[PDB]
Paper text:
One of the largest GT families in the human genome is the polypeptide N-acetylgalactosaminyl (GalNAc) transferase family (GalNAc-T1…T20, abbreviated T1…T20). Transferring GalNAc to Ser/Thr side chains, GalNAc-Ts initiate abundant O-linked glycosylation in the secretory pathway (Bennett et al., 2012, Hang and Bertozzi, 2005). All GalNAc-Ts are type II transmembrane proteins with luminal GT and lectin domains connected through a flexible linker (Bennett et al., 2012, Hang and Bertozzi, 2005, Ten Hagen et al., 2003). We made use of the fact that a double mutation (“BH,” I253A/L310A double mutant in GalNAc-T2) re-programmed GalNAc-Ts to accept alkyne-containing uridine diphosphate (UDP)-GalNAc analogs such as compounds 1–4 instead of the native substrate UDP-GalNAc (Choi et al., 2019).
A co-crystal structure of BH-T2, Mn2+, and UDP-GalNAc analog 1 at 3.1-Å resolution helped us visualize how the BH-T2 active site mutations affect enzyme-substrate binding. BH-T2 indeed contains a hole that accommodates the alkyne side chain bump in UDP-GalNAc analog 1. The formation of additional van der Waals interactions between the enzyme and substrate explain why the KM of BH-T2 toward 1 (2.6 μM) is approximately 10-fold lower than the KM of WT-T2 toward UDP-GalNAc (30 μM) (Choi et al., 2019). In turn, the fact that the kcat of BH-T2/1 (0.158 s−1) is approximately 5-fold lower than the kcat of WT-T2/UDP-GalNAc (0.813 s−1) indicates that these additional interactions may slightly slow the ring distortion that is needed to mediate the nucleophilic attack (Lira-Navarrete et al., 2014). Compounds 1, 2, and 3 were specific substrates for BH- but not WT-GalNAc-Ts.
Residue numbers in the entry:
A (entry chain A): 75 to 569
B (entry chain C): 75 to 91, 96 to 569
Write the structure that this text describes.
């Protein structure tokens, strides 16, 4: 009902500001004062590669229903999101902007924006949470393509076209922009790396992977090409509406936050679709350290519930490596999964083993016969080879959870092995250094056992325990197996 | 004449037997203590202990070269390649005494079955000495070995089988480790390939995750290595001769392994590590012999001679890493350059892209490259992405989080993220941001003779004063010591 530039920022974000001498980081866990300071149509730097910036972008594309979901968002941030969509998108490609107010304390936060050009507002009468709220918006979407966005984003130049171009060509692609960084303190728009893919460790937390050398090198002469990501971050993405609904939408019994990104990423890949990051599509996002909103069941409890619900449906037996990494999770009940499990069989979906081998080989999987795996931790320090080969001393170095020269397995043969070099007891005398040797299934000197409730690591057939007191003066040793803190070793993944 | 078991170990080792490390830079006492036919553990994979090895293979002339070797070690080598190789596959053992102080060291072994001794009139060095032995070889196939090695069970067959199938293969065993102090025979990793950094010193690369996955099926298969260590290898004799043998004007040590490795690959052959061939070797810390030329100088001479012939333009990245090498003269190379054209031979860019892709290579419009060193510490990203603080962390010389370039666009870049001066006030933290060729805040210059790193259009220099507290800062810029930065490669 109003052209967006004629909308009044100052009247909106007006009372709802930050009174004198209050906490600026109060309601949203980002600096609201700095957010409020900025204009709705603020200038941001074009963070795209030269290759993108300078390409007649296709505009004969199917239009999209943009779904933004929010609970207690900062008016400034919400507005800036909405306007950035309208300002930077070709107008014919925006069918509508659906705002799903997920039970925000003041309905006026969302309601007032309903004045704006193509903005509809849908209020949740109770608290539904991120996933359910997104599904509502998608069901209310008129367009043939869905675009999701977090409520504190800022679309960049020609952001939408490259996303649509992908989905229009192939409906099975679920496509995400590069997530530029909006600083939570100063609110500066910072350009992010285009050399990353999304991923995870066995704890099933999202993390950004560096692109492998083999991959980068294959993309050297096509730097702005699509990136095939094993996981989407989950905040900003575009998906064909019919594909979204056919492929099961979201797990409706997930709550608040967390899990859904994992779940959908697995699902899409496993059931014949693909996931991509598009470097020419840039969308800023306010990344933050704490959650500002309430979690009904406890923060970490609900996260585990959702994560479980995903793992239990899609991961097959490899779900155990998650439970191995996060034993605590086994206690959290996750309810019924029959619908989502049948969905899987209904869709004739591939197994997780497929996903691991073809989509995310990079992810280190322990052998079915391994006893433990990962890093061997002692406080902050972790068991490091220090680049040593055969006949080498082994050491400790601060942990960097990247499994480089700090990755170890504890085998069925009872050996502590890195690659095919295994910890070997050269000399049984107390104080003697241990050496890295080639793995023999029978050497006897490289057989180890975990004792004192998986806290220690004892040399088998002996009274001797691995000991780090000698690191700074030679390397790790065997010493007489007693109550030292230097003899304490815990594996990252325990089976 | 005399069979090896009837040879008198005691009495040979006898006139030799007081610092153990002063003689050979390994524990001579422990070496001397051991039997010539010492027991060593079978360090091969199980999937090799059950292999009917084809034994209708060509024989080899084994070339062992030495200058002041330990008698115990030399003998043990010779006997190991007699005991552990099938007799019909050993045509002869050629011992090239490279002007050793007592000629009796080599001469006395002439008594042993299949052993021939050649004394070098003058000091030649390892490459020239090897060429002599190869020219004196009968046999269709050459095997080279260092004079302090110990062949393992069925070591030779897998090497020959490869060369017999395809004469262009140059094959090396996996090099088990003989302890310099203990003299214990220790089994080595089968998950390594040979390689190098831009300083052109040999190093072992841990073979990639991508590779390790592909070799699940047949784990003891040949390894295509971009470099051979250069000590133990087997090569068809005619192929050795045809492909130019060794760069004859190389001296005592070093270079030859690089030179031949490049040559073989570049001129249409292949280099392999064969995991079921196990040969032990006494690895050492410093060289026990003397260098005519002053050690570091001769290494540089040889290395240059190789680089200047085979590396094309990329020789500069070597000179960037080792600036001192641009002087100390490499002499005439016209023959070896002619050799290259004579063979046709592919360019180094080919080698880098097809044989050793994993080698991190700077863009030729970079200004500096490598890590950014301050003391033991290097410039580390600390896993931080865009909008992150950058820091210092002790240098692990292994890449990744500590890889940096200084571009023609004047920017200090890691991956596609560049160092950014967000705030010009002294003491301000610098943040890592996406690289834009037009942001003046992402621009540096190197000043005060490549020692400092100054933010361009400013009075401000990269500084580690704050590094420990939060992150690295941009600082007031003057006589600090925290502002000192050496890039490993400059150009
Ligand atoms: C570009 C760009 C954006 C990329 C950022 C990104 O991937 N964010 C994901 C990341 O989000 P996050 O920033 O930590 O969480 P955030 O507080 O932004 O919550 C997601 C959105 O849903 C809203 N929300 C949240 C919780 C809730 O109960 N109800 C809501 O309506 C909230 O207002 C916000 O707009 O992980 C989530 C896990 O479920 C989702 O997958 C998010 O999409
Ligand atoms: C199996 C197995 C072991 C393989 C180990 C290996 O590759 N060793 C190499 C490694 O050797 P190193 O142990 O550092 O050197 P080392 O002192 O053993 O010299 C190599 C050989 O040359 C001999 N030599 C040396 C100096 C000399 O003037 N004359 C010689 O004949 C020496 O006695 C020995 O037989 O690098 C060398 C660089 O030129 C060669 O490439 C060696 O072959
Ligand atoms: Mn968010
Ligand atoms: Mn040697």
């Amino acid at each position: 009902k109003v052209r967006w530039p004629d909308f009044n920022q100052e009247a909106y974000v007006g009372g709802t500001m930050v009174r004198s001498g209050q906490d600026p980081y109060a309601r949203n866990k980002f600096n609201q004062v700095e957010s409020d300071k900025l204009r709705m149509d603020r200038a941001i730097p074009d963070t795209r590669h030269d290759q993108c910036q300078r390409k007649q972008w296709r505009v004969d594309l199917p239009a999209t229903s943009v779904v933004i979901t929010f609970h207690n968002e900062a008016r400034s941030a919400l507005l800036r999101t909405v306007v950035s969509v309208l300002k930077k998108s070709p107008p014919h490609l925006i069918k509508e902007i659906i705002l799903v107010d997920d039970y925000s304390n003041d309905p006026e936060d969302g309601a007032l924006l309903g004045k704006i050009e193509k903005v509809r507002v849908l209020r949740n009468d109770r608290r539904e949470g991120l996933m359910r709220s997104r599904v509502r918006g998608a069901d209310a979407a008129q367009a043939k393509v869905l675009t999701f966005l977090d409520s504190h984003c800022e679309c960049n130049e020609h952001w939408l076209e490259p996303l649509l171009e992908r989905v229009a060509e192939d409906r099975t692609r679920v496509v995400s922009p590069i997530a530029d960084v909006i600083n939570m303190d100063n609110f500066q728009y910072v350009g992010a790396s285009a050399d990353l893919k999304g991923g995870f460790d066995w704890n099933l937390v999202f993390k950004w992977d560096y692109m492998t050398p083999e991959q980068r090198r294959s993309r050297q002469g096509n730097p702005v090409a699509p990136i095939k990501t094993p996981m989407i971050a989950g905040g900003a993405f575009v998906m064909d509406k019919f594909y979204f609904e056919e492929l099961g939408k979201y797990d409706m019994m997930m709550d608040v936050w967390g899990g859904e990104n994992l779940e959908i990423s697995f699902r899409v890949w496993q059931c014949g679709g693909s996931l991509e990051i598009i470097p020419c599509s840039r969308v800023g996002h306010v990344f933050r350290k704490q959650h500002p909103y309430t979690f009904p069941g406890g923060s970490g409890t609900v996260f585990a519930r959702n994560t479980r619900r995903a793992a239990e449906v899609w991961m097959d037996e490899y779900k155990n490596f998650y439970y191995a990494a996060v034993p605590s999770a086994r206690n959290v009940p996750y309810g019924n999964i029959q619908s989502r499990l049948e969905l899987r069989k209904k869709l004739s979906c591939k197994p997780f083993k497929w996903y691991l081998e073809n989509v995310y080989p990079e992810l280190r999987v322990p052998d079915h016969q391994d006893i433990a795996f990962g890093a061997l931790q002692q406080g902050t320090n972790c068991l490091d080879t220090l680049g040593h080969f055969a006949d080498g001393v082994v050491g400790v170095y601060e942990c960097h959870n990247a499994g480089g020269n700090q990755e170890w397995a504890l085998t069925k043969e009872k050996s502590v092995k890195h690659m095919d070099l295994c910890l070997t007891v050269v000399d049984r005398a107390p104080g003697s250094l241990i050496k890295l040797q080639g793995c023999r299934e029978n050497d006897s000197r490289q057989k180890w056992e975990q004792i004192e409730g998986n806290s220690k690591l004892r040399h088998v057939g002996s009274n001797l325990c691995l000991d780090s007191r000698t690191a700074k003066s030679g390397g790790l040793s065997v010493e007489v197996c007693g109550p030292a803190l230097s003899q304490q070793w815990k594996f990252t993944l325990n089976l």
